[PDB]
Amino acid sequence: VSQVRQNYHSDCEAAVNRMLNLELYASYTYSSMYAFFDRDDVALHNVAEFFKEHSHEEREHAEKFMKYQNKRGGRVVLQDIKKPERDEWGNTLEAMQAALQLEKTVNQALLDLHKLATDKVDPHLCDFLESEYLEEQVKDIKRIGDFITNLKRLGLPENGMGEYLFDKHSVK
């Protein structure tokens, strides 16, 4: 045992390592979406940047679990970061649609980690999850849903002027 460990079920230690991997997986996936929208035959730059930005955020979410792991005196165990499901993301609607899906999946991993922590009576982990992850997730989910709705209203995937307008007016 670590000299610092207290109230940390080893089931939680191992879930954090799993969560840490999933975040990196999310990261990699967003950076694929970045490289896709920066292709000269795609060339939607602001969509590209939004995906880059989210990729940097997801990665930071992961640095933050390493830190937590150590703070509680768990041990970080790293796994292969599995490559994204596609190399080609179709267009803005399909990329936004896959992003929503990924986000909901990370949310579920998170909720499951919280529920684990409720069951093991770990109030520190419960709080860390609530304060630093859970709200961020539902903000990002509402953004992406809002994008999807607008993209559908612009007439994606078929309507290319729509996709253009979105990239010029909906992403800062």
Q: Decide which of Cu ion, a second copy, none touches 102; Cβ closer than 5 to 8 Å per partner kind.
A: none
Nearest to 46, CA basis, from 147, 136, 140 = 147
58 is in an annotated binding site: yes
The answer to whether 120 contacts a second copy (rule: CB under 8 A) is: no
d(CA 156, CA 169): 15
Binding mask 123-152 for Cu ion (x = CB under 5 A): x--xx--------x---x------------
The answer to whether 90 contacts a second copy (rule: CB under 8 A) is: no
163 is in an annotated binding site: no
d(CA 77, CA 91): 36
CB of 39 to a second copy, least distance (A): 6
Angstrom distances, CA of residue 55 to CA of 47, 61, 98, 150: 12, 10, 14, 22
Q: Decide which of Cu ion, a second copy, none touches 81; Cβ closer than 5 to 8 Å per partner kind.
A: a second copy
The answer to whether 72 contacts Cu ion (rule: CB under 5 A) is: no
CB of 36 to a second copy, least distance (A): 8
Residue list 37-56, contact with Cu ion (CB under 5 A): 49, 54
Residue with tokens 């509402």: 142
112 is in an annotated binding site: no
User: What letter represents residue 70's amino acid?
Assistant: N
137 is in an annotated binding site: yes
Instruction: Put residue 98 in one of left, alpha, beta given phi > 0 → left and psi -120 to 50 → alpha.
Output: alpha
How many Cβ atoms sit within 10 Å of the Cβ of residue 87?
9
Q: Can you say which residues are annotated as belonging to the binding site for Fe cation?
A: 23, 58, 61, 103, 137, 140
